[model samples]
Target: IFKPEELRQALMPTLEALYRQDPESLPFRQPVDPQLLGIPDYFDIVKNPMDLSTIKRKLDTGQYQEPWQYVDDVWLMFNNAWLYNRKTSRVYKFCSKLAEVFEQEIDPVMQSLG
Candidate 1:
């Protein structure tokens, strides 16, 4: 693992302060959605066609965007909402942060390589 200090600037008080706010409503306490089964890395995999149908209903009714229509500010807000909702799987979380941290650490590494 890398030094915690590596992320000091990125993980500033502002980030934590932003996250400290209470949930917009109650926490996510719903029965784990079956569609989450298709999502790798979650502890329990959901099955059951009926459950998948119900999950699909929620997703279809919820907001979705096409790649051509997606916009940055809108996507960031979507991302923040997903994170705030704890809807992400562990592997995806690590994957997302890895890209962020690598980008942050890239310039120094490139200079050294050069």
Candidate 2:
């Protein structure tokens, strides 16, 4: 109800810009491979799997109903990485920066709702 269409419409441009901003070949751009990546217990821990591609798909298909959903998915993408990978792992550090980068870019959009 709160700024429904406004937020929905506003998110697309920011999302599109983010899609372009990230590295074209970024690993987080696609779904995770529990089998291929050799993380045997990934599915057991990460209940809701999320990736940029999935988020983009949902956004394009109108699956997202609220503004918070989009950002939560973005954070989930990073959270899943944090949970499976060790704190000091390369992917963990990379995902940390990734989350912060996302937050910085997306903060104003969420704030604009007020």
Candidate 3:
């Protein structure tokens, strides 16, 4: 169950940053690319702050094996929205298509190891 207010707060930073950047001047605001901003890892740069906010609200208190879980889920949800809105051609180039590939192709084989 997603907490609506918490989710909105989580995305506020991104929205604000984009608004400040002036989309006309720089419409591209990807989280990973450091050349534009100083973000190291796109997933970390984007999700860590949101996770902190979620923790502050106590809405999302569970920690996964790695931060990648947070990043992975965010990527999944973002891609899902994009795909549903018929924008797959835009996001697919960002390696978003690999989500199910990892689930179907790599997970079974990797987790099968004993």
Candidate 4:
């Protein structure tokens, strides 16, 4: 096993600025509040809640051993959005756009590290 600093450094910008910094990333940058969003059963449906903020914290604190770990968490964040919202909802649209952009943005980073 190696120190996560290198991968962490490589990933931080992509995490923060690429997907979480721009206009569309607003919905997913932070943790989801059930009361704030007014979904009483949010916790009941989603397993292993994830968000970009939590992922950023985890990467900074050396929680990820591999880039794939970070990728998995991203999917969880998107999946939660899909699960908690109706398909026609605005959050679903935002989630889809961010997910699409993330695929394009994160792949280049993966190649560099590979």
Candidate 5:
């Protein structure tokens, strides 16, 4: 469950910096790159923070000694949405897609595991 207040608290610093743009005293320490304002064709500069590919790799390598661990990894992916959503929309989509897979697959697996 996400607490919107907690997220707002976490974002307060960055939000404050944007609001307090005094060029003489409290200007942005480094100016933001102009390119960042415009969306790029490829998410070149802003990469997906959480790599769901790792989940596939673990499945490939049989890294999950127990099925629950694999399921937990999927849970982590969903839990990370708050963090990943701040980084990039692409990461948010990746996390959201994994969340759907978690619902479809991991939920049933946990039922059987129990």
Candidate 6:
């Protein structure tokens, strides 16, 4: 078995690399289309929560870069909405369920590797 300190030393470079590249990696900050599965586009408004009109204006004026940017912005807002409406949001429940699944499935696999 590897000692804790030795394992930490071995993983330090990999962890640092991941941290350094996180911002540039879109999936790290924003969810991808593939990860959405078959979830429907339930939210009607593409408005930015900041001004609540930024995205709407962009759409009206054809200023938006890509369609995916709208999805990314909406996805971020959806996650935040779940956080704010945790007790009653279906997405909040899904997030909790996935967190448990990752803890159960991923933790053991990583532990086994070590």
Name the lDDT value of residue 76 in candidate 6: 53
Q: What's the TM-score of each model vs. the native? A: 0.23, 0.80, 0.27, 0.89, 0.42, 0.30
Q: 28-94 in candidate 4: lDDT tens per residue?
A: 8779888998888989998678988899888989889989898899889989999989999888988
Which candidate tops lDDT?
4
Spell out the clash pairs found in candidate 6. Answer: none
Ranked by TM-score from best down, the candidates are 4, 2, 5, 6, 3, 1
lDDT of 5: 0.43
lDDT string, candidate 2, 1-114, tens digits: 645556667787666655564553276878988898888888999999888789888877777778888888887887898898899987787787776667777888888854
What is the lDDT for 9 in model 6? 40
Q: How well does candidate 3 score on lDDT at residue 41?
A: 53
Ten-residue region with minimum lDDT total, candidate 2: 16-25
Name the best candidate (by TM-score): 4
- Which regions of candidate 3 fall more than 4 Å away from where they truly are? 1-59, 88-114
lDDT of the candidates, in the order given: 0.31, 0.76, 0.37, 0.83, 0.43, 0.39
Candidates 5 and 6 compared by TM-score, better number: 5
lDDT of 1 by residue, 1-114 (tens): 322333333223322332232332111222333356353433232221111223223324432232111122222433433443353755335335433443454445334322
lDDT (tens digit, per residue) of candidate 6 on 30-65 = 332332735343233322332123434444454444
Residues 1-99, candidate 5, lDDT per residue (tens digit)?
Answer: 323344333323322332243331121123223356453432453343223455555555556656555556556545555343454665455545445
Best to worst by lDDT, what's the order?
Answer: 4, 2, 5, 6, 3, 1
The Cα error of candidate 6 at residue 69, in Å, is: 0.8
Q: Per-residue CA lDDT of candidate 3, range 18-95, in tens?
A: 224332213123322445544355543344322223322332354433333544554444453344333554333333
Tell me the lDDT of candidate 2.
Answer: 0.76
